[PDB]
């Protein structure tokens, strides 16, 4: 029996485990670390990826330019050097995007008129949000229906306000410029269902959005979050408004913490990060670029003027940020400052840092200070998350970029304390024993302050590769192939990793192409064909599809498909195929002496493909083994159909026969056809017409189409009959066969067949079995030995089965065979039928082409027409490689005054 101590041990254990779980729950709600899983951006000078931003920052580049000339601004009237002159700007320089007007409207399902009415902030947020999710290695379509939240800093800049009122039945003018819709439209178009909020606290807006997103994630309200801000100056209003105040730097430069600092330099930017609980990123296998530890927001309160900063409030928000995540100021290596280059604000910011991080600071490790604004200017609502981008890029590349224009630090700050040093040059910042951390500040003119703590992320052959690319237009398809071509021309390039990334991290769009390749060089050759709109090589296939799934039929033909060594490659390259073959030989064992595997390999002393009694069991094994290979790639038949003994493969695949019983039926039937050797013939060819012609004789096996038919009978009549058709018109192709099937010649063997095979026990079919004998869907239990004799005996109504299935809504027809013998007849029948007019028909292997590459090419052909394939099964052990983002096909949309 249990002592009192043994029982107390269990109760006290439960109480301390309850406590531990409660404490963990508190710490999740309060301070759960948040993974930055990816980033995206549009910044001045064509800086349209985070890597380009890093490239700019590592060189010390400054992207300042003249005012745009393609936005309808009146540049002559707009400039005037006197600050007090109404309606003008004394600066003519800013940070402007390359192509603020460019948008791929059709990609996003937006009409041309809606696009023109849309604020470019909204349009570039759609592109960057798509890129953002692609850069996380996530198929954006997989976020449809998820609780992904959207948290954006965005304000109106007057787009469209000086355009003549027009008609607008659809209300495009209202939704096109509303900041609420800037966030809501991302949710709408990507099918996101978490909260979607636009916020405005001026310059701190995007870090306030980040603070709210972190809250939403810690509470479990959002599963992931799209976070950032957008500022595109559609009108010059901000240069005019701030000119009246002499608030702008005359040369346009943001000289943060330099003695030259003399006002703002304003810029455009659209910057986003994707956030998730770190523990959730690890669970889901998402990359983690860095971690948000903590953040704080407060207000200046009663400052010396509405828009004046408050040193004491900045001190407090710094301390609150560090305290919210349990860190000390000494834990922080560097600050990405608000750093606007104003003469009043730079000293107050620096003094607040000197008084928090700089107090009692390790003499050998001052706080590093800089500002991305010195490179790219002040991106307004996007400013805070833009500084976060720099921090993450600096962490990932092991280096703190220089901040510009500090050759003389401002003398309005007493740097003598020595606790804070400006990044006058780049500084190594390598992963090591000391955990790397940095902070980002943003302090808005409405007085709301943000400080966020960011930490490094926690320490973390020659076979055929199917490469699948897709896009929403043909031009975008060519671009996507050309981008992958360039990627694979690199040495860094992991062929299999690229294929797996293409298959699992990218949305599958309507225009689709695929290359099956074993080397990078072959892959590039095939992708270059796609990039030119061609598909001439055999390893390249293209199509277009409006659906992403099909109702699939597996078709199993009879004889005619075989060829010497068929499937031999697949024994080595495909365990699924060989496993099924081996299973076939175990069940064929107590009925024959030879082995199917030995025939396919063409072993020594192994039978050849001339004896009906070896061909049919081989082809059966090949077919049911190709069926299993298709099924391991995720292609499940919704129905099966067989032609003559192909029905036996069909019935096994459907589940109606065990493999033991199907082997009996095929070996049984196949020997008994050997008996009738030399005693029959068959040949090919309308049904009613051919039956008139056959009255003179008493020797019709199959109806494959309205002009394709098979006649069977005695050798004599066979030739006599051909002479007539010979000396009259259409051809009569013989058939390599020693016998005459589906004719009365069969009756003599009825008795033995049935007794030999009468032992079988058919089961219910798990997959619709549409009989070509009785022209209907049949319960598997009806498929007893009597049925299998009636299949040998009666006429194969193949075309009618296809037709019936086309007309019932099946739209993918897969010939599961080593060589395509019914594809044409299926195609013709599907066309004439009142069934789907976009059906697909494909085979499995070809006489020349029975290796895994040919099989992958067949699956590719099915896929570019909408059959879903699990391509990762082809790429075991690969890791997904980072890819370029979607090649948007842009036109200009701009409402002009």
């Amino acid at each position, epitope marked *: *029996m*249990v002592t009192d101590s043994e029982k107390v041990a269990e*109760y006290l254990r439960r109480a301390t485990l309850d406590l531990r779980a409660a404490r963990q729950r508190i710490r999740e709600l309060e301070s759960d670390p948040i993974a930055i899983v990816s980033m995206a951006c549009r910044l001045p000078g064509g800086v349209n990826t985070p890597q380009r931003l890093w490239e700019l920052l590592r060189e010390g580049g400054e992207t300042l330019s003249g005012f745009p000339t393609d936005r309808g601004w009146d540049l002559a009237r707009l400039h005037h050097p006197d600050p007090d002159n109404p309606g003008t700007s004394y600066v003519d320089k800013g940070g402007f995007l390359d192509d603020a007007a460019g948008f791929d409207a059709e990609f996003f399902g937006v009409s041309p008129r809606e696009a023109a009415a849309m604020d470019p902030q909204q349009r570039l947020l759609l592109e960057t949000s798509w890129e953002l999710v692609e850069n996380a290695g996530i198929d954006p379509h997989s976020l449809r229906g998820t609780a992904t939240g959207v948290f954006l800093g965005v304000a109106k800049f007057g787009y469209g306000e000086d355009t003549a009122a027009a008609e607008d039945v659809e209300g495009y003018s209202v939704t096109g410029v509303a900041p609420a819709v800037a966030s809501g439209r991302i949710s709408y178009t990507m099918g996101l269902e978490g909260p979607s909020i636009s916020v405005d606290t001026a310059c701190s807006s995007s870090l306030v959005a980040l603070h709210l997103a972190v809250e939403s994630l810690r509470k479990g309200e959002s599963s992931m979050a799209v976070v950032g801000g957008a500022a595109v100056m559609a009108t010059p209003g901000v240069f005019v408004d701030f000119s009246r105040q002499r608030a702008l730097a005359a040369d346009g430069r943001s000289k943060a913490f330099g003695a030259g600092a003399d006002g703002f330099g304003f810029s455009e930017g659209v910057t986003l990060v994707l956030l998730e609980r770190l523990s959730e990123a690890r669970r889901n296998g998402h990359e983690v670029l860095a971690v948000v530890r903590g953040s704080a927001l407060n207000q200046d309160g009663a400052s010396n003027g509405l828009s004046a900063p408050s040193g004491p409030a900045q001190r407090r928000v710094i301390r609150q940020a560090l305290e919210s995540c349990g860190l000390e100021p000494g834990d922080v290596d560097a600050v990405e400052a608000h750093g606007t280059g104003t003469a009043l604000g730079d000293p107050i910011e620096a003094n607040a840092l000197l008084d928090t991080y700089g107090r009692d600071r390790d003499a050998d490790r001052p706080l590093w200070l800089g500002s991305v604004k010195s490179n790219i200017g002040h991106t307004q609502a996007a400013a805070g998350v833009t500084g976060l981008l720099k921090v993450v890029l600096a962490l990932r590349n092991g280096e703190l970029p220089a901040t510009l224009h500090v050759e003389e630090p401002t003398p309005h700050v007493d740097w003598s304390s020595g606790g804070v040093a400006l990044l006058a040059g780049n500084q190594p910042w390598r992963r090591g024993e000391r955990t790397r951390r940095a902070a980002v500040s943003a302090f808005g003119i409405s007085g709301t302050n943000a400080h966020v703590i960011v930490e490094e992320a926690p320490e973390r052959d020659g076979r055929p590769v199917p490469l699948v690319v897709s896009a929403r237009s043909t031009a975008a398809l060519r671009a996507q192939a050309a981008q992958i071509a360039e990627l694979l021309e690199r040495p860094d390039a992991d062929l299999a990793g690229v294929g797996l990334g293409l298959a699992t991290t990218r949305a599958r769009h309507e225009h689709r192409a695929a290359v099956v390749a074993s080397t990078r060089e072959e892959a590039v050759r095939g992708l270059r064909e796609i990039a030119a709109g061609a598909a001439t090589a055999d390893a390249v296939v293209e199509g277009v599809t409006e659906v992403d799934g099909r109702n699939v039929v597996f078709l199993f033909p009879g004889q005619g498909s075989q060829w010497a060594g068929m499937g031999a490659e697949l024994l080595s390259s495909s365990p699924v195929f060989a496993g099924k073959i081996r299973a076939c030989d175990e069940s064929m064992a107590p009925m024959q002496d030879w082995k199917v595997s030995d025939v396919l390999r063409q072993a020594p002393g192994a039978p050849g493909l001339d004896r009906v009694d070896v061909v049919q069991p081989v082809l059966f094994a090949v077919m049911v083994s190709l069926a299993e290979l298709w099924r391991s790639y995720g292609v499940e038949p919704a129905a099966v159909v067989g032609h003559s003994q192909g029905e036996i493969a069909a019935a096994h695949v459907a589940g109606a026969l065990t493999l033991e019983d199907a082997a009996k039926l095929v070996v049984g039937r196949s020997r008994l056809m050997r008996s009738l050797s030399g005693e029959g013939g068959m040949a090919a060819v309308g049904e009613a017409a051919v039956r008139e012609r056959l009255r003179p004789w008493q020797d019709v096996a199959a109806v494959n189409g309205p002009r394709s038919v098979v006649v069977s009978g005695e050798p004599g009549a066979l030739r006599a009959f051909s002479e007539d058709c010979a000396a009259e018109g259409i051809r009569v192709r013989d058939i390599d066969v020693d016998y005459a099937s589906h004719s009365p010649q069969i009756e003599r063997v009825r008795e033995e067949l049935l007794e030999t095979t009468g032992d079988i026990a058919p089961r219910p079919a798990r997959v619709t079995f549409h009989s070509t004998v009785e022209s209907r869907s049949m319960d598997g239990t009806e498929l007893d030995a009597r049925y299998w004799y009636r299949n040998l005996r009666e006429t194969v109504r193949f075309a009618d089965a296809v037709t019936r299935l086309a007309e019932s809504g099946y739209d993918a027809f897969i010939e599961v065979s080593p060589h395509p013998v019914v594809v044409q007849a299926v195609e013709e029948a599907v066309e004439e039928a009142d069934g789907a007019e976009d059906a697909v028909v494909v085979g499995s292997l070809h006489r020349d082409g029975g290796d895994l590459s040919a099989f992958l090419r067949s699956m590719a052909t099915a896929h570019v027409s909408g059959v879903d394939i699990r391509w990762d099964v082809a790429l075991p052990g690969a890791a997904p490689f980072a890819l370029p983002t979607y090649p948007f096909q842009r036109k200009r949309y701009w409402l002009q005054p």
Partner: antibody
């Protein structure tokens, strides 16, 4: 999260043997006593036996109805508890639950049906 | 000298409304350490048993906080503040003063009032 995954039962003839396993995950298996409890179809829950953790000697106790036929063991490296059932009888037919704890049964496996029939 | 518990044989309940299950032991379950050695379990139909309450009135992590227990000595109650339809099944009060427990007993069959 805590999991107790049970396997190894099914149909067995009288007089024969079966070994049930309970594979634990998400906690330190070696710190817990583990118990077996069974439920004949449509009846109540009957205690079968239990094994102590190594911290308390690793020993077992058994209901008188199974003593000398059933034995419990554990593998702390694989985090598995076993119920070895010999000389099975028709009245042993039951769903067999593994549970964490010898006194407080704070987490239960999904159960394994054992049917003894000729 | 064997320690048994008894609870009502059946108990119809109404979702939205409270429910109480009483338990009486043949012997005080109050230990010198101050706790009553009485635990409550639930077996939902076709599911395995689950723990609800331990040592009389402690609710295990993850159990819905509509469940509580009280009592002392020989008399105990499991209370559901507002019954849900998913709460039907068999409730068991189990003493832990004397071990092993050979049986869980007949328990209290909770079903929907009508």
């Amino acid at each position: 999260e805590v999991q107790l995954v049970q396997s190894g039962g099914g149909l067995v003839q009288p007089g024969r043997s079966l070994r049930l396993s309970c594979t634990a995950s998400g906690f330190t298996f070696g710190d817990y006593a583990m118990s077996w409890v069974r439920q004949a179809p449509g009846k109540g829950l009957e205690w079968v036996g239990f094994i102590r953790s190594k911290a308390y000697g690793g020993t077992t106790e058994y209901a008188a109805s199974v003593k000398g036929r059933f034995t419990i063991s554990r593998d702390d490296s694989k985090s598995i508890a076993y119920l070895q059932m010999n000389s099975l009888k028709t009245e042993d037919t039951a769903v067999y639950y593994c549970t964490r704890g010898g006194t407080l049964f704070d987490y239960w496996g999904q159960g394994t049906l054992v049917t003894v029939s000729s | 000298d064997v320690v048994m518990t008894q609870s009502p044989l059946s108990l119809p309940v109404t979702p939205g409304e409270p429910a109480s299950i009483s338990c009486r032991s043949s012997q005080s379950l109050l230990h010198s350490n101050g706790y009553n050695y009485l635990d409550w379990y639930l077996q939902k139909p076709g599911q395995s048993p689950q723990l609800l309450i331990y040592l009389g009135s402690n609710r295990a992590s993850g159990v819905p906080d509509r469940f509580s227990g009280s009592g002392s000595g020989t008399d105990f109650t499991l209370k559901i503040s507002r019954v849900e339809a998913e709460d039907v099944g068999v409730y068991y009060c189990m003493q832990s003063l004397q071990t092993p427990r050979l049986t869980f007993g007949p328990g209290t069959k909770v079903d929907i009032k009508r």
